[PDB]
Design an enzyme around this catalytic site. Structure first.
Site, PDB file in Angstrom:
ATOM      1  N   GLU A 113       0.805  -1.197   0.000  1.00 32.71           N
ATOM      2  CA  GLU A 113       0.000   0.000   0.000  1.00 32.71           C
ATOM      3  C   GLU A 113       0.850   1.264   0.000  1.00 32.71           C
ATOM      4  OE1 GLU A 113      -1.678   1.590   3.740  1.00 32.71           O
ATOM      5  OE2 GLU A 113      -1.373  -0.461   4.492  1.00 32.71           O
ATOM      6  N   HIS A 159     -10.784   4.213   2.824  1.00 31.17           N
ATOM      7  CA  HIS A 159     -10.074   3.535   3.894  1.00 31.17           C
ATOM      8  C   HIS A 159     -10.231   2.020   3.828  1.00 31.17           C
ATOM      9  CE1 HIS A 159      -8.744   6.847   6.673  1.00 31.17           C
ATOM     10  NE2 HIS A 159      -7.823   5.913   6.839  1.00 31.17           N
TER      11      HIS A 159
END
Length: 108
Positions: free
Chosen positions: A71, A100
């Site tokens: 990520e 998120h």
């Protein structure tokens, strides 16, 4: 700095690594980043958090043997972190999330 969805995605599939304006959470903490103060821009000017392993605990991203996910923060400039992330695999599939890590869509 390269920190857009398209810019970072085309950088990864090509150079097979993050651009240099990225550091992991570890590096950031050691430099003085305190998440609860939103001070990243003050302790590591021009950098963004990125490169850490992503568990994919909730199994929302496609798995395969030998495939690891990572990520990186997208669109970050200062303050507290936002909710935008790029998700990239060891075989160079690229997904985005803007909520998120709740949902994901393919961008490469």
């Amino acid at each position: 700095v390269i920190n857009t969805f398209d810019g970072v995605a085309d950088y990864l599939q090509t150079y097979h690594k993050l651009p240099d304006n990225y550091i992991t959470k570890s590096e950031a903490q050691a430099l003085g980043w305190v998440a609860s103060k939103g001070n990243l821009a003050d302790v590591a000017p021009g950098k963004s958090i990125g490169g850490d392993i992503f568990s994919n605990r909730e199994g929302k991203l496609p798995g395969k043997s030998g495939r690891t996910w990572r990520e990186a923060d997208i669109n970050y400039t200062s303050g507290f972190r936002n909710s935008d992330r790029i998700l990239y695999s060891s075989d160079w599939l690229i997904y985005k999330t803007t909520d998120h890590y709740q949902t994901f869509t393919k961008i490469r």
